[PDB]
């Protein structure tokens, strides 16, 4: 059941600590908000994960693999959507190409032909990627992500950008998707908490490189909890299954 | 007077195409307004017509008393009128220019190149760095500054020469919740300071309209669906007709929430 264990890791530069006794598990079928300020070791923790960057201290275990392995093998479980990945792609390439491109047979574009119906692509499936939308070049991105038949999609802030009905519309792919693969993990990296849907039940507060809190969305996220976080007073409501937060 | 932009049913085409459509709008001295739509709205348009970037089409536009062509228009002499922060405007600046220079370099626009820069116009910078809150950085490269710092620096630059409007495009785009809250907590702020300054935040967030914003326009393919009162306009009803989607919106806490269906 266990994909990701981090044991109290450490990550240092220079000299300089960026991340401290960081203890984070992720287990099949787990949906998790990463959440922090600009500059909270967010994307150092995810080079961690996708193994781009090593832990200094502490043990790191990748869908059973620890360094001392290699780091290919780990990004094979891994779908990451980031920002430095959308621009790899070129304004000429058709959609469909571009998301057989995760994985060439009839089974393989017929695998790209399904998770284009699951993200709301197909319609422009034959289309150049030039031609879509930040919202729908961000679906294409995850219909690709999901292509090498990952154990974790990770999304790093994939609704930056985009407005109220672009973001809604990433937000309930990723809750089919997670109806279609029950047993699929996700991260979801953010800066608003308005992003977080009902699908996304866990959460792990980061702030200065540690972890603050982590346990269930509906108990951490409070006024009390956040304006502690924060050291700002600030509310917190959950009002029709979302969550909205004031500062005071 | 205290009427500053007075648009009737301007348009706006292009290559035969029509870009902006009816667009009646009035700022008043004091009005701080909302211009609200998705991305593709046609929200820079307008605010390329407002800055006598592009004119308009059709319609009649006047811009702080002046209307194209008559005597005393210039597209140079509507921009002193307004302090403008933008995207676009931000990284035209060097990571090796101090935050002072920066904001003093705001007066160019109304007082020209060749008037020397005394204690007066200093003080002017100064205190424009204080209300944005980035006194203490002052001397610093504003290469060292953060996003937020550097939004907060450019309004300070926008309010050099005392603008009659502040026109803010998108200001919040890519700040983390801490950053995003400073940058509006500073516009609440200049409100008080300056009740009689004109303002309008351009946003596709209903989350980072204030109190103080009173009034809004809803801008979908290039026409205005709605305007007047946010209070009136900013309710689960009208946000549903406008999207054409189920929402619910609440005010709580002086501020908008907004939840898809």
Redo the contacts between chains.
Sequence with gaps: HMLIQLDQIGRMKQGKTILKKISWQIAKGDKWILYG??GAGKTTLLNILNAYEPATSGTVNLFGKMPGYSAETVRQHIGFVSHSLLEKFQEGERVIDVVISGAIDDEIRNEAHQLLKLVGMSAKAQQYIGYL??GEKQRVMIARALMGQPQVLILDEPA???????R?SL??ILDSLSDSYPTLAMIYVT????EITANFSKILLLKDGQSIQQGAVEDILTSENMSRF?Q?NV?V?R????F?????
């Excluded at 930056?160 to 672009?166: E, M, N, P, R, T």
């Excluded at 009002?239 to 979302?242: C, K």
């Design positions: 300020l600009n939308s930040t930056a950008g985009l407005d109220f009905i672009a809604e937000l309930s800066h608003f908490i308005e924060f700002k509310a409501q009002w029709n299954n979302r909205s937060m004031a500062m005071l």
